[PDB]
From Swiss-Prot, chain B:
Record note on quaternary structure: UreH, UreF and UreG form a complex that acts as a GTP-hydrolysis-dependent molecular chaperone, activating the urease apoprotein by helping to assemble the nickel containing metallocenter of UreC. The UreE protein probably delivers the nickel.
Protein family (similarity comment): Belongs to the UreD family.
Inactivation phenotype: Cells do not express urease.
Main location (coarse class): cytoplasm
Protein's name according to its UniProt entry: Urease accessory protein UreH
UniProt-annotated location(s): Cytoplasm
Keyword Magnesium in record: no
Record function comment: Required for maturation of urease via the functional incorporation of the urease nickel metallocenter.
GO CC field: cytoplasm
Molecular functions per Gene Ontology: nickel cation binding
Source organism of this protein record: Helicobacter pylori (strain ATCC 700392 / 26695)
Domain of life: Bacteria
UniProtKB/Swiss-Prot annotation, chains C, E:
Phylogenetic placement of the source organism: Bacteria, Pseudomonadati, Campylobacterota, Epsilonproteobacteria, Campylobacterales
Protein name: Urease subunit alpha
The protein's assembly and partners: Heterohexamer of 3 UreA (alpha) and 3 UreB (beta) subunits. Four heterohexamers assemble to form a 16 nm dodecameric complex.
Organism name: Helicobacter pylori (strain ATCC 700392 / 26695) (Campylobacter pylori)
Pfam families hit by this protein: Urease_beta (PF00699), Urease_gamma (PF00547)
GO biological process, one term: urea catabolic process
Catalysed reactions, semicolon-separated: urea + 2 H2O + H(+) = hydrogencarbonate + 2 NH4(+)
Compartment(s) where it occurs, according to its Swiss-Prot or TrEMBL record: Cytoplasm
UniProtKB/Swiss-Prot annotation, chain F:
Region of the whole protein represented: 1 to 114 of 569
Keywords: Cytoplasm, Hydrolase, Metal-binding, Nickel, Virulence
A GO term, aspect molecular function: nickel cation binding
Record note on disruption phenotype: Cells do not express urease.
Note: The novel dodecameric structure of the enzyme may allow it to remain active at the cell surface at acidic gastric pH. Within this dodecameric structure the 12 active sites are clustered within the interior of the proteinaceous shell. This may allow a high local concentration of ammonia within the enzyme which may protect the nickel-chelating groups from protonation.
Coiled-coil region list: none
Gene, per the UniProt record: ureB
Protein name according to UniProt: Urease subunit beta
Length: 569, 260, 238, 342, 238, 114
């Protein structure tokens, strides 16, 4: 045996148990809770390192020999912040733990066997998270997809048909034919994709036709008419077909208030967009639904974190998104907002308390597609600076806060939309949609994206260079992004009904086609680290939000992290 | 105790554009204020809507408006919707509006009625400055509260000061104080069972007292009157059960002024 | 220096703005593309400098170009310039409205309208109904909402308004402030007069027989002003 | 005839497309760069910017080979993939060959041991595929003599036959005289210039994945490179001792500079030593043919594709490069891929 | 002017560097991207000028940015800037290490390590062996190489080292210079103790019976220090 | 909350953490190392027990709904001696842990849905 200095050990292999790492330039400190490695047997790749024929690459590998192994990765996940080797086989996460050669090392399971068929990826000093899941995507342009992908989002659930006005306003892909258009266009992109149908219809036949055509859920948007009748019928059909329903409630209170909308929902699982109201007429009373069990609340990028400039852009964003001409007196008079800095500030505190479970974008319709993760971590850092460490922290670290805010965009949307069996976390058996971050750039710019077990996007230097590092370095598509490899790498999510009817063969899709499941029997209690159901007393006379009596508010941030240190523009 | 990140300011300066229309020369607005491009109806004056991106004034709100209409500008300034004063628990909502009208400029300031909620404390201070040739049509409608739900005079206090100066000389003073705690505003001298009160000031407008009186008399559902102030400018005070007769009377008077 | 596609696009926009600025210094009157690029690039640079707020930038964007700095028609063509700029407190959308004063000489795509008013809903007689908002929030009603089924916090004679909609320009809305009482004009719903959706008070053909069922449903669900007889006789399907 | 398209080659040089046999498939953006440089065939290995690919020219395993073969459908370039030869398991090596690799790569970073060399050469003789080797830098298991004994006089394609600073240097240059060794040299060390030696250590450290902030890795990064060896490489190229020029793209080598650096070496040798004694006339035709074979027909022969590509001959595939003589060797006029302009 | 994709990328990088330089002139503190672009663009321009060597450029790149010219954390984030620049003698990789001195205020992604040493190979007892390099070249041995089968130019008691590996941090190496004699610590190989590959001296389970076969093979193949009895009895499989 | 005697609890549901059981008539004593159940939510089948429609048998089961569940079993395995519910689905062991109805009980994973 021998003892080496912890500084040298960490430089060689990355942090081990009890070591703390700052996340980005924020104030959040993640502590390695435990380590699967055996000291002195670490896997290293290089000139005379251990990942060599006969030493750590087995000459008699197990039949479960890995296709790819990520060595010495700091896994940051809702299941824990720990250090391990991630083995990927056949596009899934084959094993998490100590990998290597059973012939020359101890404690190597059969599912983490490194052999001659194994590619190596050095994760030492690198954080591995699951890919982001953005569930409010307005499919306005296909250029959103590479932007989100480079930001670190690997699954996009949303709706739209291009820059139509219905798509600019709503997250809706309406009808069997438009669903076919979008499903066949999805073959191009390196991103898991799911499409939502139009729920604004009192016709069960039409709603069921959309679900069988392939939508994974319904979107009931105010711009197509959010009426109690439509809510009721859509929820009935969705309970029949086991698909999620998302709602963007009526801003004008035309048919009723928040109480009438909740009566139409009738205690059935519903995923709510802009649960803070986003200036709608249901605000601020719609925040009350964030305390119900059956409501899965999501909040959008632009209002988090609350900053000095947050309130200035809201009216322009609202008018352009809702398609109200700024040169028309009638449209300007119609564009009435009930937004308040009190509500905007309360949104961040609700996120910190876990009242809000999902963060999303609403891309190019009051929200930025490439900033879901960055704004989530900006909100986490701002809440840490304001209120200090959470009372749930079991140590001198921010692990609980890290896990809560990471669940906000990794596992909670996956549960909400019924894809948690496939994506959302770094677990054995899930698809290998992984993001490699360097801790200095955590939350803003990933090092690389592993899509379906193969690298799909990466920071790359000059192609003519003698090494991959020299400038200019930017995000380039890798081999999993091209040819027929992207068909194996990417997933299209459909409803179970469409999957049974054979949507893949009918539409000639080459991507993997997977059915969503367990969308109707989930409540707020099923969200990870964000299952806080509290009676939210909203005084609309004073626009005051109280949870368990105590009032919630936050101060505007003059300067956020991960914003100007990392981006030229 | 301003809940907004920065102070609520709205500095607007309008001038005559190259094409002869009334354009916004300069504008600077912090939340909740916002300014869009002026609207140009076919035959009327250039309309500017003072957008307020908020459900209404709440505790600690302190708005600072500074409008500057340049020479030869025919501008009508309206608001998005009814201005509601919310329940200010321990504080108050204050608005300070300073308007400067240039030579040969017509300003029709026609905001929507003010609706104070229960326990509402509001302090408005309007200071209008005019030239000799400037024309002004100022208006203000105050509601007793949410009348249809039996919320009558339940607010804390409404103070509204209006000071109109011409050539830097005071020509109109108004001090409207409504404090239900001190006195019953429902008495025969304050409101006499009416719920909406309109105060209109016509300065240098080319309309006759007889014409204004005829308009008031032909207006239905309104108990109103018009007189001449010390500086020989028209002052109209009207009461009504609802805001519809008052708005109709105000637009009738505005049309009578503009048709000249 | 890991560059995102957004950063690459912004770099292209910045250098388009630089080209426009160089042309303006040379004295060339800017065209539409040059003017938009110049304004956007200036806003981006100011935000990067970080001494100004979004409101200050919205004000400042309107002072960059004089009417004599652009070609004829550019000011008419440019209605507003939006740009997402990275401030010290994150990315914010700065919108500059009418950044250039119109000269009025040439107006591309201008309309030459007739001086005749458009008569909407011709041949339909309008009835007048007084509506009070007894709720605590304003209510906006669209031109084509079935007025019988509007928010139950609105108080009016619903029997008079069954089968009718607002007589306003389609796509516009009427706002009822809390406590405020307004008079609105209503016209019969056209076409087949089949009311589906809304508050599910009718969900069938709108006739006198369905009027009684709708009134009973509205009274049961607590819609203000809906008067149904106490001794209501049910039908086989209702 | 009436079905014929015409292409004016008057005043234009036509050569066969280049064949780059050391390609580290680190990024797909290398492929358009090499294509624009005049390379039409890329033989190599890799799975994207993994560290194994950054170090080695290896596509390991049946599944990764399937990944790369299906991704290859995107690109306008003839492609061939090499499997991992660093294995003492005949079954695994044969499985990779049957999965679709055109040969084996035995790289020091996966362990270049005599046992692995022996087993890979046995399986390759069974399946008629090439074996390329990047020998052991550390002399862990043996020296150049032990490596050559493991090779045992079987056809082997050697990368960095000059050593590239490895522990086998400079003695590994001796294998360039053997019959069974097909020697290749990489871009960065040819031609020998004033700045050649400055970048070598940085390239070596980044390629071999040794952290420059670690004392142990810096101490490990020991090079035996000499300006004498770097200079001798160009002369060996001129004499024909080195048969293949290649890149080792983005791992100590530039993918879009194989042809340019070959012609720079030819020009430098012409300036230094004058006309070759084999020139039968007042021209440099023999030198032109030697240096052109270095990257057109010799790698094709080495990797067994000379029946299809590598030269302008009847029956071969139409992978042609049109150069204007003023831009010859640096920027082509156009590329004809499979009979159509690509 | 036939432009290659590499040239287009370098043009984008040069103009990113130009933007960074303009911001620095304006007095904006540069961020990570701006600093990297500025250094790279300056190196490219100097190489194009062609008055400097790669070594001179490596030296000069470290003087471009002062610690007060960049935001906090930029110096910590930037470890080295590589750039392939076209010199008069071809394309060369210029690497500038630590171009900016760290201010120490903010360190993004910094480690907060415990002050406790890591005990590697715990529970394994190490034996000491003296090794002489009688060859003419240095020999590096990795932490997990089977030490029995190392280069035959190393001289030591191979019988003592059968089944063992170096007791060092995994991934590190021990260097034996020619003629130099060192003492190394060896520990038993773990796991199944199946030695495959290396010099093919064992190629089977490592036990006392395979030790004799390995020693005889090493003596036959000329491994220094391998002592096998002259009267060696062969097995059925060896 | 309420406390019941350990003897009564063990008679109702079998031994829990820290309880020891003799193996056969031998001298070997096995101790329950840990328990997956949540006290007061144990699955029981019988006349008026918990495994009933709407209480522990879900009326909205997950798509991984079990084919068979073994309740309150003392698993003795090389992986440990513990107490759990074993879920069997499609001939494989679908889950080991706390089974039941997610609508009315806490800590029920999708793969142990009754």
């Amino acid at each position: 045996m021998k003892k080496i200095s912890r500084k040298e050990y960490v430089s060689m292999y990355g942090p081990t148990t009890g070591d703390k790492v700052r996340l980005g330039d924020t104030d959040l400190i993640a502590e390695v809770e435990h380590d699967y490695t055996i000291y002195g047997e670490e896997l290293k790749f290089g000139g005379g390192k251990t990942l060599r024929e006969g030493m750590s690459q087995s000459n008699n590998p197990s039949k479960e020999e890995l296709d790819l192994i990520i060595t010495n990765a700091l896994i940051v996940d809702y299941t824990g912040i720990y250090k391990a080797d991630i083995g990927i086989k056949d596009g899934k996460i084959a094993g998490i733990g100590k990998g290597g050669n059973k012939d020359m090392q101890d404690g190597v399971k059969n599912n983490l066997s490194v052999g001659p068929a194994t590619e190596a990826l050095a994760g030492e000093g690198l954080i591995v998270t699951a890919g982001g899941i953005d569930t409010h995507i307005h499919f306005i342009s296909p250029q959103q997809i590479p932007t989100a992908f480079a930001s670190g989002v690997t699954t996009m659930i949303g709706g739209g048909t291009g820059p139509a006005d219905g798509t600019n306003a709503t997250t809706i892909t309406p009808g069997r034919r438009n669903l076919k258009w979008m499903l066949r266009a999805a073959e191009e992109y390196s991103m898991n994709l799911g499409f939502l149908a139009k729920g604004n219809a009192s016709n069960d036949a039409s709603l069921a036709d959309q679900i069988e055509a392939g939508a994974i859920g319904f979107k009931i948007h105010e711009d197509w008419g959010t009426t109690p009748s439509a809510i009721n019928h859509a929820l009935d059909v969705a309970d029949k077909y086991d698909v999620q329903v998302a709602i963007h409630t009526d801003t004008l209170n035309e048919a009723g208030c928040v109480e009438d909308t909740m009566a139409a929902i009738a205690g059935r699982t519903m995923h709510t967009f802009h649960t803070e109201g986003a200036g709608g007429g249901h605000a601020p009373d719609i925040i009350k639904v964030a305390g119900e069990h059956n409501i899965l609340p999501a909040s959008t990028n632009p209002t988090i974190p609350f900053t000095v400039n947050t309130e200035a852009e809201h009216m322009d964003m609202l008018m352009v998104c809702h398609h109200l001409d700024k040169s028309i007196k009638e449209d300007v008079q119609f564009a009435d907002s009930r937004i308040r800095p009190q509500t905007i500030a309360a949104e961040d505190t609700l996120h910190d308390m876990g009242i809000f479970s999902i963060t999303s974008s609403d891309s190019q319709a009051m929200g930025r597609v490439g900033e879901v993760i960055t704004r989530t971590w900006q909100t986490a850092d701002k809440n840490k600076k304001e209120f200090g460490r959470l009372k749930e922290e079991k140590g001198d670290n921010d692990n609980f806060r890290i896990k809560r805010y990471l669940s906000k965009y990794t596992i909670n949307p996956a549960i909400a939309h019924g894809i948690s069996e496939y994506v959302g976390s770094v677990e054995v058996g899930k698809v290998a949609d992984l993001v490699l971050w360097s801790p200095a750039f955590f939350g803003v710019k990933p090092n690389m994206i592993i899509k379906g077990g193969f690298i799909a996007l990466s920071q790359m230097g000059d192609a003519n260079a003698s090494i991959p590092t020299p400038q200019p370095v930017y995000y380039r598509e890798m081999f999993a992004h091209h040819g027929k490899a992207k068909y194996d790498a990417n997933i299209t999510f459909v409803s179970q009904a469409a999957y049974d009817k054979g949507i893949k063969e009918e539409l000639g899709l080459e991507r993997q086609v997977l059915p969503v499941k367990n969308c109707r029997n989930i409540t707020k209690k099923d969200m990870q680290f964000n299952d806080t159901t509290a009676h939210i007393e909203v005084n609309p006379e004073t626009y005051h939000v109280f949870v368990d009596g105590k009032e919630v508010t936050s101060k505007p941030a003059n300067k956020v992290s991960l914003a100007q240190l990392f981006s030229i523009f | 105790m301003n809940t907004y990140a920065q102070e609520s300011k709205l500095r607007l300066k309008t001038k005559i554009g190259a094409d002869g229309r009334c354009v916004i020369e300069d504008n600077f607005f912090t939340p909740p204020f916002k300014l869009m491009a002026p609207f140009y109806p076919k035959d009327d004056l250039a309309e500017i809507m003072l957008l307020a991106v908020s459900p209404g004034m709440m505790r600690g709100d302190a708005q600072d408006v500074q409008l500057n209409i340049g020479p030869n500008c025919k501008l009508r300034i309206t608001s998005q919707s009814f201005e509601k004063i919310h329940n200010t628990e321990d504080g108050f909502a204050s608005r300070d509006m300073h308007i400067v009208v240039g030579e040969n400029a017509f300003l029709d300031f026609a905001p929507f009625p003010l609706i104070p909620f229960e326990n509402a404390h509001f302090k408005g201070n309007t200071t209008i400055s005019l030239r000799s040739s400037s024309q002004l049509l100022y208006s203000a409608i105050i509601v007793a509260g949410r009348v249809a739900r039996n919320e009558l005079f339940k607010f804390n206090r409404l103070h509204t000061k209006i000071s109109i100066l011409q050539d830097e000389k005071p020509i109109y003073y108004d001090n409207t104080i409504l404090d239900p705690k001190t006195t019953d505003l429902n008495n025969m001298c304050m409101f006499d069972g009416y719920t909406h009160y309109l105060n209109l000031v016509l300065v240098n407008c080319p309309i006759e007292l007889s014409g204004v009186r005829e308009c008031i008399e032909e207006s239905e559902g309104v108990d109103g009157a018009v007189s001449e102030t010390a500086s020989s400018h028209l002052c109209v005070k009207a009461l009504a059960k609802g805001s519809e007769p008052l708005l109709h009377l105000r637009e009738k008077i505005a049309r009578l002024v503009t048709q000249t | 220096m890991k560059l995102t596609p957004k950063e690459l696009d912004k770099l292209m926009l910045h250098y388009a703005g630089e080209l426009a600025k160089k042309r303006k210094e040379k004295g060339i009157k800017l065209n539409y593309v040059e003017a938009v690029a110049l304004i956007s690039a200036h806003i981006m640079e100011e935000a990067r400098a970080g001494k100004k707020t979004a409101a200050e930038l919205m004000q400042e964007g309107r002072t960059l170009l004089k009417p004599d700095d652009v070609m004829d028609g550019v000011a008419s063509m440019i209605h507003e310039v939006g740009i997402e700029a990275m401030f010290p407190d994150g990315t914010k959308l700065v919108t500059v409205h009418t950044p250039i004063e119109a000269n009025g000489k040439l107006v591309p795509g201008e309309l030459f309208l007739k001086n005749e008013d458009i008569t909407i809903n011709e041949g339909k007689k309008a009835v007048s109904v007084k509506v009070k908002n007894v709720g605590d929030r304003p209510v906006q009603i669209g031109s084509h909402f079935h007025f019988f089924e509007v928010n139950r916090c609105l108080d009016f004679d619903r029997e008079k308004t069954f089968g009718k909609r607002l007589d306003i320009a389609s796509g516009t809305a009427v706002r009822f402030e809390p406590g405020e009482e307004k008079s609105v004009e209503l016209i019969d719903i056209g076409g087949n007069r089949r009311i589906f959706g809304f508050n599910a008070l009718v969900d069938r053909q709108a006739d006198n027989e369905s009027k009684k069922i709708a009134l009973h449903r509205a009274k049961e669900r607590g819609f203000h002003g809906a008067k149904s007889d106490d001794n209501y006789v049910k039908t086989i399907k209702e």
